[PDB]
Amino acid sequence: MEGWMMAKPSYVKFEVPKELAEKALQAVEIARDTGKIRKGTNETTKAVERGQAKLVIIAEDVDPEEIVAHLPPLCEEKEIPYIYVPSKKELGAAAGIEVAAASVAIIEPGKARDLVEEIAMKVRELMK
Numbered sequence: 561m562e563g564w565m566m567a568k569p570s571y572v573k574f575e576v577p578k579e580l581a582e583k584a585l586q587a588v589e590i591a592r593d594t595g596k597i598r599k600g601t602n603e604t605t606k607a608v609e610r611g612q613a614k615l616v617i618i619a620e621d622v623d624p625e626e627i628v629a630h631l632p633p634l635c636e637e638k639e640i641p642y643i644y645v646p647s648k649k650e651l652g653a654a655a656g657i658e659v660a661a662a663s664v665a666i667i668e669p670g671k672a673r674d675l676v677e678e679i680a681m682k683v684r685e686l687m688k
Contacts, residue, residue: 595670619648
């Protein structure tokens with residue numbers, strides 16, 4: 561019982577292809593520019609709990625793990641798509657802020673409508 565899970569945080573439930581992680585970041589930027597997003601685990605969690613989130617993006621380098629470890633279980637409970645990206649700094653950047661973001665929620669994709677649906681469908685495959 562070894563593998564990819566050894567090198568990644570325990571809150572990362574699955575491997576995300578590089579290009580797919582790149583699409584998630586682009587969707588965040590597009591949504592930031594033409595739709596509506598929520599930044600940070602606090603807001604992201606609320607959006608998920610309130611059923612507003614269309615997609616949840618979680619950085620893979622957040623420490624301590626408790627900061628976002630509750631997101632994956634909650635998203636699956638609420639049937640809300642979530643995907644991971646390598647850097648919390650980059651996620652912050654995509655979200656339009658100067659500091660890092662542990663997680664982000666896309667409420668209205670705006671022009672990223674189709675991209676978000678693509679991401680959700682692929683992640684759906686992955687989680688299998």
